[PDB]
Amino acid sequence: MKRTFQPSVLKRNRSHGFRARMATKNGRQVLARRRAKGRARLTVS
Amino acid sequence: AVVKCKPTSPGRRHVVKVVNPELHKGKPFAPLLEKNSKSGGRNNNGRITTRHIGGGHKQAYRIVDFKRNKDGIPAVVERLEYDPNRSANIALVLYKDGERRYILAPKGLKAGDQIQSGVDAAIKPGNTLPMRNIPVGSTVHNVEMKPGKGGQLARSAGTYVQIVARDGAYVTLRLRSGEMRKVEADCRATLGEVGNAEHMLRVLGKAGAARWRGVRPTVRGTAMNPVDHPHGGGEGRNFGKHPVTPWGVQTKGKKTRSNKRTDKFIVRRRS
Amino acid sequence: MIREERLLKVLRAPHVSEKASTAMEKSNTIVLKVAKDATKAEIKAAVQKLFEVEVEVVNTLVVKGKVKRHGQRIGRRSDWKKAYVTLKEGQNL
RNA sequence: GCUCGCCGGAAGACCAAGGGUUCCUGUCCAACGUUAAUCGGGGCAGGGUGAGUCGACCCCUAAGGCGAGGCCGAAAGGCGUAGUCGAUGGGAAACAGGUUAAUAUUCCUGUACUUGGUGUUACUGCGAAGGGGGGACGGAGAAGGCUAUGUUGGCCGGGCGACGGUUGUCCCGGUUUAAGCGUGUAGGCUGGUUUUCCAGGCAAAUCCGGAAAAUCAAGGCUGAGGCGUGAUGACGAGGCACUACGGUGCUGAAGCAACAAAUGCCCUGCUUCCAGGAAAAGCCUCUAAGCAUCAGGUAACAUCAAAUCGUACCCCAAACCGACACAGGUGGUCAGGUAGAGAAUACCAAGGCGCUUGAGAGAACUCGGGUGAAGGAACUAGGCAAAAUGGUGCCGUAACUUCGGGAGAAGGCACGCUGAUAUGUAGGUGAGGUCCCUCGCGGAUGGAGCUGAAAUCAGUCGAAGAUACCAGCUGGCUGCAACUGUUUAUUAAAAACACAGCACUGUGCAAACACGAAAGUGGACGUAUACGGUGUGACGCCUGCCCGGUGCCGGAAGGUUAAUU
RNA sequence: AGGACCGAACCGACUAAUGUUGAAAAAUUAGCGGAUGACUUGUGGCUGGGGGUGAAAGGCCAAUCAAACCGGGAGAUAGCU
Ligand SMILES: [K+]
Ligand SMILES: [K+]
Ligand SMILES: [K+]
Ligand SMILES: [K+]
Ligand SMILES: [K+]
Ligand SMILES: [K+]
Ligand SMILES: [K+]
Ligand SMILES: [K+]
Ligand SMILES: [K+]
Ligand SMILES: [K+]
Ligand SMILES: [K+]
Ligand SMILES: [K+]
Ligand SMILES: [K+]
Ligand SMILES: [K+]
Ligand SMILES: [K+]
Ligand SMILES: [K+]
Ligand SMILES: [K+]
Ligand SMILES: [Mg+2]
Ligand SMILES: [Mg+2]
Ligand SMILES: [Mg+2]
Ligand SMILES: [Mg+2]
Ligand SMILES: [Mg+2]
Ligand SMILES: [Mg+2]
Ligand SMILES: [Mg+2]
Ligand SMILES: [Mg+2]
Ligand SMILES: [Mg+2]
Ligand SMILES: [Mg+2]
Ligand SMILES: [Mg+2]
Ligand SMILES: [Mg+2]
Ligand SMILES: [Mg+2]
Ligand SMILES: [Mg+2]
Ligand SMILES: [Mg+2]
Ligand SMILES: [Mg+2]
Ligand SMILES: [Mg+2]
Ligand SMILES: [Mg+2]
Ligand SMILES: [Mg+2]
Ligand SMILES: [Mg+2]
Ligand SMILES: [Mg+2]
Ligand SMILES: [Mg+2]
Ligand SMILES: [Mg+2]
Ligand SMILES: [Mg+2]
Ligand SMILES: [Mg+2]
Ligand SMILES: [Mg+2]
Ligand SMILES: [Mg+2]
Ligand SMILES: [Mg+2]
Ligand SMILES: [Mg+2]
Ligand SMILES: [Mg+2]
Ligand SMILES: [Mg+2]
Ligand SMILES: [Mg+2]
Ligand SMILES: [Mg+2]
Ligand SMILES: [Mg+2]
Ligand SMILES: [Mg+2]
Ligand SMILES: [Mg+2]
Ligand SMILES: [Mg+2]
Ligand SMILES: [Mg+2]
Ligand SMILES: [Mg+2]
Ligand SMILES: [Mg+2]
Ligand SMILES: [Mg+2]
Ligand SMILES: [Mg+2]
Ligand SMILES: [Mg+2]
Ligand SMILES: [Mg+2]
Ligand SMILES: [Mg+2]
Ligand SMILES: [Mg+2]
Ligand SMILES: [Mg+2]
Ligand SMILES: [Mg+2]
Ligand SMILES: [Mg+2]
Ligand SMILES: [Mg+2]
Ligand SMILES: [Mg+2]
Ligand SMILES: [Mg+2]
Ligand SMILES: [Mg+2]
Ligand SMILES: [Mg+2]
Ligand SMILES: [Mg+2]
Ligand SMILES: [Mg+2]
Ligand SMILES: [Mg+2]
Ligand SMILES: [Mg+2]
Ligand SMILES: [Mg+2]
Ligand SMILES: [Mg+2]
Ligand SMILES: [Mg+2]
Ligand SMILES: [Mg+2]
Ligand SMILES: [Mg+2]
């Protein structure tokens, strides 16, 4: 059966990538939270 | 001509077609075409703002001359064409100077007929004049509401306006709605009625024919749940409320015009 | 024209393998490890200057580094650039 | 290694997406592998991805995104102009053969092609952010011409048979060759050329559009395939010689014709229909400012350049999505033989596999199947399930009907093989030969050869000839819904939803209405034969009485009545 | 010609049996419906939570839906166990 995750790198990057995060205040707050938590991987990029 | 399809299948039994042999079978005039991609009735917020719009055939936009302001230069009708963007047919016209334009095709207009616009044009179908220069009692179409703005009234297939009176700077028009409206006498109009009056005799015949025209299904309020529509709900077919729109406004008689700016121009409402 | 400083950094090592040995004997082609950012033009110039031979053509590829377990921890070797440098017929490097 | 079995419009082959070394070689067997494992997609190490032409990048745009100024908004922000991004679409160019353990249109061999830079010669109005052309477009259908491809013959090489026969009307195999360059054919489209003039193409124009004469009748554009060359080459059945028996080396005959033939190509065509079928650049052409014997343009010639990134491997799957080496899911391309209408189905080819526990036994019971005396729905909530019907041709076919239907109604007959008609017919294809020729890839003619149904008559085997696989059960009465559609992903597919049709009602355009503190946007580049809302639901015959209640519409005298004063 | 007919691919999901610590958190097998259209499918895009989208089932919005998910108010409150 067709499951929910149907990977596409283009859609992944456009939806959740670094530049998508940087494009809005709320996306930049995601990056701020993840840097503050000390995440090794900030985004899907 | 109005042609009834033979009932060779249940989707054909009720079809009534308007078949016009005068219309150009070839492609339209490419310099007067533009793309017009579809909306699905969605605005720039991406939200449906008009329900029941979607799909249907791809259509190119024909640039139609509603202004008719190329005055004093005769034009000859080259051919009548199907226009998917409107109920009326259009006419490709060639001016003496070599310019081509599209116009709304009036009743009776055929290839080879001569037309002209301006103050000194003849009172003949397809000629455009200021309504100051058109006799009272005349049948006109493509009527401007402001001078130079381009025709906005009586553009649909078979429609027309009657100039009932002339009073100083204004003319009184009887519109197809039955409304009596004042318009400035400097506003242009084209003599005659819009052609293709048989348009209203078509019978689509099947669901799919509406879908081809980009009309999506209407779901009745009473078929829904209360959460979706005021009419929703009931164990079985129930109603028991005054009919309303999906947004709760009475939909059987309640007047919705509210334009104090334009009230002065309305002599008599359609009633 | 490329500066000599640049040319002295583009060639990293000869690449030793069965395919490299066969390339030399059959097609007069030397196989080199080169700087990751080296272009075909830079490799050609560097080989002609430093090895004193005449180069016909340079073909290049990027070798992607292997992922490798050292104990438990996962690591990755570096990507590197390989150059197949075809010499003219009678050069004999 | 031999045999057996299974797939073969796939369980083969090549990819995109996704994955990321799983690829190849050596080595190891703890763990992983539902068992053992010497094996592995497992561990460890080493190797492996070669491009002017394939793809990305790049030029160009779609939906849409972002958006200098701008407009709007307590702030955050929203919208949007100029622009700038954005492929799933448009835009230059390479083929065949050979080669690695593992890449190859990338390496090698042979033979090509494209774009741009610089110079040399010649001739020469070049010049855009502008104009015009072009690019540039739908559905269905029909037929002709072809090719891929197949079959048969010829040719060449080999064979003479484990058991009766097999020197032939015998058996097996091969019979392949590209892009490019040249030629211009079946077919498709269109009348040419010249002169003069002009309110149009934001200005100009020699271009496009328009007008008027002159003149001639064949001019131009497009185009599959074929043919020639590419090719005195490459490939080649096999033979010979080695092997480190995995694989190499050596050498190599014929390499033709006829017939059949696509869903591929001519064809972005043609015919036809209504629901009326992207954009922008490259490209061609026109000039403006400008430069003006300079730059620039044009062609040939020479020379230089074409970077960078991807390229292994899986890819209907043990490598992707499903926690698994999971009976699931996953877009594109290729399309052999016999039978067949067929991409169904059966059996096969190329190729790929036997599904990572086996060995016995032959109880009940369960699962999946086969057959069944007599009976034949007695079963059961219900013929649930099963059994049955099933093909082609011809004959024949009721009520009712909206005249289409109902209908494949129902029901019935024929069907294999052999011979003859006819040593293979009707039809299709079409060589040599002959004839003509505004001269070719040409007609007129001719039927050699090839292919080839269908029918009739006669005979003949079986219980049975649509023999397997495959493949409608049929009829009668009635409720509901007109119909095709749609729906509760995962217990409901229906009488529910939708529907064409009908009606009421709103809406005069800065429309009503909707999204939005707003700007705006949709409605619509629509305009009352239009658009929104509501109910009803094809069609036929129709749709009665009630305005007291609640709503809506109109009224506006009188009563009552807010802020305010 | 056709929301025409029979029927593969393709799209569905009417019946039955199996399976129900499954081979599978919805399938398999035999049958079944549509199959030029109101068809189906690839890639990309847009609509956002009292919000969307809905040929309308309160259906669907990442195995979640009469108000998604994540974090926070937060140790909500719990005359109840
Ligand atoms: K409805
Ligand atoms: K109701
Ligand atoms: K909802
Ligand atoms: K109800
Ligand atoms: K109900
Ligand atoms: K074992
Ligand atoms: K390249
Ligand atoms: K690049
Ligand atoms: K024998
Ligand atoms: K080529
Ligand atoms: K050729
Ligand atoms: K490769
Ligand atoms: K792939
Ligand atoms: K019935
Ligand atoms: K159903
Ligand atoms: K009343
Ligand atoms: K909510
Ligand atoms: Mg509507
Ligand atoms: Mg129309
Ligand atoms: Mg329209
Ligand atoms: Mg309706
Ligand atoms: Mg309901
Ligand atoms: Mg309510
Ligand atoms: Mg009731
Ligand atoms: Mg009641
Ligand atoms: Mg090379
Ligand atoms: Mg490369
Ligand atoms: Mg590994
Ligand atoms: Mg391996
Ligand atoms: Mg084990
Ligand atoms: Mg052991
Ligand atoms: Mg391994
Ligand atoms: Mg290319
Ligand atoms: Mg845009
Ligand atoms: Mg914006
Ligand atoms: Mg700004
Ligand atoms: Mg761009
Ligand atoms: Mg693309
Ligand atoms: Mg390989
Ligand atoms: Mg078409
Ligand atoms: Mg052929
Ligand atoms: Mg012989
Ligand atoms: Mg014998
Ligand atoms: Mg033979
Ligand atoms: Mg087809
Ligand atoms: Mg590969
Ligand atoms: Mg297994
Ligand atoms: Mg699997
Ligand atoms: Mg599929
Ligand atoms: Mg076959
Ligand atoms: Mg099959
Ligand atoms: Mg048994
Ligand atoms: Mg049993
Ligand atoms: Mg049985
Ligand atoms: Mg019995
Ligand atoms: Mg018996
Ligand atoms: Mg019996
Ligand atoms: Mg009986
Ligand atoms: Mg009975
Ligand atoms: Mg009984
Ligand atoms: Mg009983
Ligand atoms: Mg049954
Ligand atoms: Mg059965
Ligand atoms: Mg009853
Ligand atoms: Mg129905
Ligand atoms: Mg149905
Ligand atoms: Mg369900
Ligand atoms: Mg169901
Ligand atoms: Mg507006
Ligand atoms: Mg109803
Ligand atoms: Mg049908
Ligand atoms: Mg469904
Ligand atoms: Mg099934
Ligand atoms: Mg049917
Ligand atoms: Mg069917
Ligand atoms: Mg309910
Ligand atoms: Mg869900
Ligand atoms: Mg709530
Ligand atoms: Mg609190
Ligand atoms: Mg608590």
3-state helix, strand, coil in chain A (%, to 5): 60, 0, 40
Q: Which residue has the tokens 């493509």?
A: B142
Question: Which string of b and e fits A1-30 if b means at least 16 CB within 10 Å?
Answer: eeeeeeeeeeeeeeeebeebbeeeeebeeb
Is B178:B271 a contact under the CB 8 Å cutoff?
yes
Q: How far apart are CA B171 and CA B181, in angstroms?
A: 8
Is B89:B71 a contact under the CB 8 Å cutoff?
no
Q: CB B49: neighbour CB atoms within 10 A?
A: 12
Which bases on strand E have an atom closer than 7 Å to a protein beta carbon? 1-4, 24, 26-27, 37-39, 43-48, 52-58, 62-63, 66-67
Of B81, B113, B145, the domain-final residue: B113
Q: How far apart are CA B151 and CA B157, in angstroms?
A: 14
Token readout for B136 is 């009272």
* Dihedral angle of Cα A25, A30, A36, A37, to the nearest 10 degrees: 170
CA-based nearest residue to B205, from B1, B73, B7, B70:
B7
Resolution value in angstroms: 1.6
Which helix or strand (DSSP H or E) is residue A36 part of? helix A25-37
CA-based nearest residue to C83, from C75, B173, C48:
C48
Token readout for B74 is 């005769």
Task: Name the CA radius of gyration of chain C, rounded.
Answer: 15
The rounded Å distance from CA B257 to ligand 10 centre is 69
Q: Are residues B4 and B81 in the same domain?
A: yes
Q: Are residues B177 and B244 in the same domain?
A: no
Which bases on strand D have an atom closer than 7 Å to a protein beta carbon? 17-21, 43-45, 47-51, 62-66, 76-77, 79-80, 87, 100-102, 106-108, 132-134, 136-137, 198-201, 209-210, 273-279, 305-311, 320-322, 328-330, 402-404, 482-484, 496-501, 504-516, 520-539, 550-554
Question: Which string of b and e fits B206-228 if b means at least 16 CB within 10 Å?
Answer: beeebbeebbbeeeebbeeeeee
The rounded Å distance from CA A1 to ligand 47 centre is 20
Q: Is B103 helix (H, G, I), strand (E, B) or coil?
A: strand
Q: Regarding beta strands C67-70 and C55-63, do their DSSP bridges make them parallel or antiparallel, or are they unpaired?
A: unpaired
Q: How far apart are CA B86 and CA C53, in angstroms?
A: 77
Q: Are residues B151 and B186 in the same domain?
A: yes
Backbone angles phi, psi at A35, to 5 degrees: -60, -45
Backbone angles phi, psi at B178, to 5 degrees: 100, -10
Of B83, B113, B143, the domain-final residue: B113
The CATH number linked to B231 is 4.10.950.10
From residue A18, give the alpha-carbon distance in Å to each of A11, A35, B12, B18.
Answer: 13, 13, 57, 58
CA angle B163, B167, B169 (to 5 degrees): 100
The total of structural domains in chain C comes to 1
3-state helix, strand, coil in chain B (%, to 5): 5, 30, 65
Q: Are residues B107 and B169 in the same domain?
A: no
Q: Which nucleotide is nearest to C76 (CA to C1')?
A: D21
The rounded Å distance from CA B34 to ligand 37 centre is 21
CA-based nearest residue to B105, from B83, B122, B120:
B83
Chain centroid to Cα B25, Å, comes to 23
The rounded Å distance from CA C39 to ligand 57 centre is 90
Domain range enclosing C81: 1-93
Q: Is C61 helix (H, G, I), strand (E, B) or coil?
A: strand
Q: Are residues B137 and B84 in the same domain?
A: no
Q: Which residue has the tokens 């879908």?
A: B211
The CATH number linked to B44 is 2.40.50.140
Token readout for B187 is 């506003």
* Dihedral angle of Cα C18, C21, C22, C23, to the nearest 10 degrees: 120
Amino acid at residue number B123: I
Domain range enclosing B150: 117-194
Query: For B201, what's the count of Cα atoms within 13 Å in the CB-facing half-sphere?
Result: 11
Q: Regarding beta strands B188-191 and B139-141, do their DSSP bridges make them parallel or antiparallel, or are they unpaired?
A: antiparallel
Q: Is B31 helix (H, G, I), strand (E, B) or coil?
A: helix
Q: Are residues B38 and B70 in the same domain?
A: yes
Is B156:B194 a contact under the CB 8 Å cutoff?
yes
